[PDB]
Paper text:
To elucidate the structural basis leading to substrate recognition and the catalytic mechanism of [name], we solved the structures of [name] complexed with various sugar donors, including the ternary complex [name]/[name]-Glc/PO43- (1.95 Å) and two binary complexes, [name]/[name]-GlcNAc (1.88 Å) and [name]/[name]-GalNAc (1.64 Å). The active site of [name] is present in a narrow cleft formed by the face-to-face apposition of the NTD and CTD, with [name]-sugar bound to the CTD and PO43- bound to the NTD. To reveal the structural mechanism that underlies the sugar donor promiscuity of [name], models of [name] in complex with other [name]-sugars, including [name]/[name]-Gal, [name]/[name]-Xyl and [name]/[name]-Rha, were further constructed by docking based on the crystal structure of [name]/[name]-Glc/PO43-. [name]/[name]-Glc/SeP, a ternary complex model that represents the reaction state, was constructed by docking based on the structure of [name]/[name]-Glc/PO43-. SeP was shown to bind in a narrow pocket near [name]-Glc, consisting of a series of hydrophilic residues (N20, H58, R61, T83, T85, and R155), which stabilize SeP in the pocket by forming abundant hydrogen bonds. Prior structural results indicated that K158 can form a weak hydrogen bond with the β-phosphate of [name] at 3.2 Å, potentially impacting its ability to abstract protons and hampering its likelihood of acting as a catalytic base. However, a nearly complete loss of catalytic activity was observed for the K158A mutant, suggesting that the hydrogen bond on K158’s proton abstraction has a subtle influence and underscoring the significance of K158 for the enzymatic activity of [name]. Moreover, in the [name]/[name]-Glc/PO43- complex structure, K158 forms a stable water-mediated bridge with PO43-, a phenomenon also observed between SeP and K258 in SelA6. Thus, the Se-P bond cleavage mediated by K158 in [name] may begin with the amino side chain of K158, which captures a proton from a water molecule. The resulting negatively charged water molecules attack the partially positively charged phosphorus atom in the Se–P bond, leading to bond disruption and the formation of a selenosugar product.
A specific SEN biosynthetic pathway was identified in [name] DSM 30034, which is recognized as a way to incorporate Se into organic matter in bacteria. The bacterial SEN biosynthesis gene cluster encodes three proteins, SenA, [name], and SenC. [name] catalyzes the generation of the key intermediate selenoglucose product using SeP synthesized by selenophosphate synthetase (named SelD or SenC)15. In contrast to other types of GTs, [name] performs dual functions in two-step catalytic reactions, catalyzing the formation of C–Se glycosidic bonds and the subsequent cleavage of Se-P bonds to generate the final product.
Residue numbers in the entry: 3 to 328
Amino acid sequence: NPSLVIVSPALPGANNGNWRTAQRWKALLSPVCSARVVQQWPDADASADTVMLALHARRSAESIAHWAHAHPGRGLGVVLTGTDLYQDIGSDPQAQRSLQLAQRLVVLQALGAEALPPECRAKARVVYQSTSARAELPKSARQLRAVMVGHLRQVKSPQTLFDAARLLCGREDIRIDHIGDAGDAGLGELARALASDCPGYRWLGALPHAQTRQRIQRAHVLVHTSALEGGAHVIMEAVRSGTPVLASRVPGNVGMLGNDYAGYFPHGDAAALAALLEACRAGQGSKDRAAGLLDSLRTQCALRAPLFDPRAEQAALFQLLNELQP
Ligand SMILES: O=c1ccn([C@@H]2O[C@H](COP(=O)(O)OP(=O)(O)O[C@H]3O[C@H](CO)[C@@H](O)[C@H](O)[C@H]3O)[C@@H](O)[C@H]2O)c(=O)[nH]1
């Protein structure tokens, strides 16, 4: 059986996407190979590795190079997690070199290969991520509770959420919970000042993943404003909890929710987001109502939900492994 090494830049045990992906892939591939996760390669155990899957064409570029030089033409998959595909590979030589050296390039939703140079598309492979489902909860019509989840950095465009919450500062019937570490400098100060001014907006800080999944499950709607995504875990998690999504219309989000999804706003457009939230609120009512925006979005998200089934991610990873060690 193959001996797979997964390279993740994330600090071990970190509560973020890069660590989550590596540990989940390890678990899904364990029945057909010996799999391990490292932050860099090689290490003492490198001689027995036969396949490498490396997350982020730039952050892992050094381990990717080490593998490519030790195993030219063989065994290397490079996973495009987001800022590499939608930023770095434009002009970062390290990210560009990882694209050339790889035997396969993994993108995390169907649109990802459009951002690759055309000479890299033949070796590109789509692997939708997966997450465990949660029962869809019945929810009250008395208030609209929205949540957004993302450690604060500029690529998450949290200012769109700040500005839309400000536009709704007077609305007692709408609540916005914001989950995520302070991160990029100054953004935490913006969240704190906004929560002090507008009681409907709460910045909860970073929360353990278990509690975050529960809050996504409880919310009426998840908002995601990012300038770019590889394929966001939190959108998956909402969809697989029966919670519909309002998302910025950028390729990483569109690949997750579908070209026909009715819950997009243009990136950076806080008034558009605020108006979608108002429409979600306006549509709320009793079991004897019909045809609210939230209900149309729930119907659409339910059609997306099978994309994020772990048995499906596993089968695609099995195929990927077979291609990297035939
Ligand atoms: O306070 C917090 C903040 C985050 N999360 C979790 O963090 C995870 C990962 O978040 P995600 O939405 O995927 O964002 P990133 O961490 O930025 O992940 C990056 O990398 C992933 C691949 O590893 C891609 O799928 C994403 O698009 C890309 O943004 C999710 O499971 C969240 O529930 C928490 O539990 N608590």
